[PDB]
Swiss-Prot record, chains A, B, C, D, E, F, G, H, I, J:
Residues 13-31 are annotated as: Interaction with PSEN1. Zn(2+) 2 binds at H2, H3. It comes from Homo sapiens. The chain holds residues 683 to 713 of 770 of the full protein. The record marks K5, L6, F8, F9, V29, I30 as: Cleavage. The record marks M24 as: Susceptible to oxidation. This is P3(42). The record marks G22 as: Implicated in free radical propagation.
Length: 31, 31, 31, 31, 31, 31, 31, 31, 31, 31
């Protein structure tokens, strides 16, 4: 198994007010 | 198995107010 | 198996208020 | 098996308020 | 097997309030 | 003239993704 | 003239992603 | 003229991601 | 003219990520 | 003219990540 660059942002992000997650194992993610 | 660039944003993102997830194993994702 | 660029955004995204997921294994995704 | 560019957005997206999923294995996706 | 560009949006999308899925294996998708 | 309780929701609403308006005077309401 | 309780929600609302307006005078309301 | 309680939420609101307006005079409200 | 309690929240609000406006005179409100 | 309690929160608010405005005269409010 080989994980790499799960989430990619090639350009600029103005702001983040939610949840940015690459990899999770449980649950209960609420926006 | 070979994971790579699961989520790609080639250009700029104004803002994030929800959930951005590359890979998950459980559940219960609520926007 | 070879996963790559599951979700692609060639241009700019104004905002995100829901759920953006590349790959999931469980369920219970609610918008 | 070779997955690539499951969901493609060639141009800009105004906003997202639902669910954008490239690949899923379970169910219970509610808009 | 070779999957590629399952869902294509050549032009801009105003907004998304439902479910956009490239490939699914289970069911129970509710708009 | 006596306006009261133009729109009533006796029970819980799961979500709103359209337009809920009690009273309007102009037009151009688009769902 | 006597306006009161134009929009009523007797129970809990899960979320709002559209437009909730009690009274408007112009137009151009887009969901 | 007597305005009062134009928009009423008797119970708890989970979240707001749209527009909640009591009274407006212009237009151009976009969800 | 007598304005009072244009927007009422009788119970707790989980979070706000949109726009909550009591009264407006112009326009161009975007969720 | 008599303005009072344009926006009312009877109970606790978990958090605010958008815009809470009592009264406005211009426009260009973006969530």
């Amino acid at each position: 198994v080989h994980h790499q660059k799960l989430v990619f942002f090639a350009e600029d992000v103005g702001s983040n007010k939610g949840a940015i997650i690459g990899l999770m194992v449980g649950g209960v993610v609420i926006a």
